[PDB]
Every structure is written in structure tokens, then in C-alpha cells.
């Protein structure tokens, strides 16, 4: 300012506005706190859900599609002992789909080589990794892990 009344005008204009802006800053920061707490309470489940949906869509993109048949075609490797449980998972999926007419799980004569699986446990994981470090054993050859 240049004059006493100008000085008083500016002084009042800033004295109201500073308190107003501090008030809004503090309340909006409290709003940040509330909404960010609400987000953090659930983000992990949100992360898991979005990642699961991503995985589901990506794996679905491996099937053959309406270009071949309106129903999808897929192919899987599985341990034999769990065929019943896999069919039960298929049953669960169809139940969630709500269709009366059911799905089907099919065996077939195969030319591709089976993978190797070991049903590792907490104690033997390190040793199984140690023997895997030099090449995984062929289907059903003796595992050096239990002796190592």
C-alpha cells in the first residue's frame, strides 16, 4: 500500500484469507486422511482381485474361440491323482455360470512329453531346487532329491 487506509484494507484482506485458506487446507488434508484410510483398508484385496482378473483374461486368451466354435476349446496338463478335483473345479465354474446343461472334461491320446512334478514340502524344497539346478528329471525317473 501507499496510505494508511490502503494498509488497513490489505491487512484485513489478508488476515481473513490466511485463516480461510488454512482452514480449507486442514479440512481437505483431513479429507485426504479419511479417503486414503478408506483406500488402504481395502487396497490389498483390490490388488488381488484386479491381478486375478488379469490372469483369468490372459489365460482365456490361450483358448480357441468363436472363430472355431461359440464354446471355447482348451488344453491342460495335470497330475492324474487330481482329475476328480479338476472336474470338481469345472463343476464349480459351471455352477457359477448357472447353466443346466453341463460341461465336459476329456482325456486324449497325447504325443507331447509330460512335465515332472514332485509334490514338494516345506522341508525338502531346498534340496529339490538343488537337484533342479542341473536340469529337471525326465518323466518318472528316480529323483536324486530324497537321497541328496
Amino acid at each position: 500500500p501507499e496510505t494508511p487506509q490502503e494498509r488497513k484494507e490489505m491487512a484485513s484482506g489478508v488476515n481473513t484469507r490466511i485463516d480461510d485458506l488454512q482452514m480449507v487446507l486442514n479440512q481437505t488434508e483431513d479429507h485426504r486422511q479419511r479417503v486414503l484410510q478408506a483406500a488402504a483398508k481395502n487396497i490389498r484385496v483390490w490388488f488381488i482381485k484386479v491381478r486375478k482378473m488379469k490372469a483369468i483374461y490372459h489365460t482365456l486368451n490361450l483358448c480357441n474361440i468363436d472363430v472355431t466354435q461359440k464354446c471355447l476349446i482348451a488344453e491342460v496338463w495335470c497330475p492324474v491323482t487330481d482329475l476328480d478335483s479338476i472336474q470338481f473345479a469345472l463343476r464349480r465354474g459351471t455352477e457359477h455360470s448357472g447353466s443346466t446343461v453341463p460341461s465336459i472334461l476329456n482325456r486324449m491320446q497325447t504325443n507331447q512329453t509330460p512335465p515332472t512334478y514332485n509334490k514338494t514340502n516345506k522341508f525338502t524344497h531346498g534340496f529339490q531346487n538343488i537337484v533342479d539346478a542341473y536340469g529337471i528329471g525326465t518323466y518318472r525317473e528316480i529323483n536324486p532329491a530324497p537321497y541328496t
Binding site: 489478508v14 485426504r32 490389498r44
Partner: protein, 97 residues
């Protein structure tokens, strides 16, 4: 389904941005360990709305906070200068103005 994959990546970007802001903030992330299998019905749209709104409001408040901070600090300094100016005139107050 790659389009749905792209939508999931947009969702993951939203969530990771919010997670980074949470890390920058002091509030903890909870580690409850809930592991549901996501259903088929379009919960995706509800979750997209929720993530979009959460991240959008976070962005808007974050941006507005800086401007309010700047203006408040400017007005504080102006108040201080206005205070000291009269002391600088403190000699003899005969004139009406």
C-alpha cells in the same frame, strides 16, 4: 480378451498409483490376507468405478493442496510485510493520512 486385459492393466495402474501415494503417506496398508476368487459377473465395472473415483479424488485434492499452500504462504508473507511497514512509518502521526 486382450481388451479386457488392457482394462485390467489400467485398473492396476490406478491401484499402483494409489498405493504409491499411500506409501508416501503414513497410513498403513492392511495385510489381512483375504484371497477370494473373483467371480464372473461384472464386478469389474463396479471396481472400475471405485478405483477411478478413488484415484481421481486423490489426484484432485493433491493438486489443489499445492495451489492452496502457495497462496496461503504468499498471504502470510504479505501479512508480515504489512505489519512491519507501519513500524517503518513510526515517527510522527500528525497527518490525517
Amino acid at each position: 480378451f486382450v481388451n479386457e486385459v488392457r482394462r485390467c492393466e489400467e485398473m492396476d495402474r490406478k491401484l499402483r498409483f494409489v498405493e504409491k501415494e499411500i506409501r508416501k503417506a503414513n497410513i498403513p496398508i492392511m495385510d489381512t490376507g483375504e484371497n477370494p476368487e473373483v467371480p464372473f459377473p461384472r464386478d469389474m465395472i463396479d471396481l472400475e468405478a471405485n478405483f477411478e473415483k478413488i484415484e481421481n479424488e486423490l489426484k484432485e485434492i493433491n493438486t489443489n493442496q499445492e495451489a492452496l499452500k502457495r497462496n496461503f504462504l504468499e498471504l502470510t508473507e504479505l501479512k508480515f510485510i504489512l505489519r512491519k511497514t507501519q513500524q517503518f512509518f513510526d515517527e510522527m502521526a500528525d497527518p490525517d493520512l
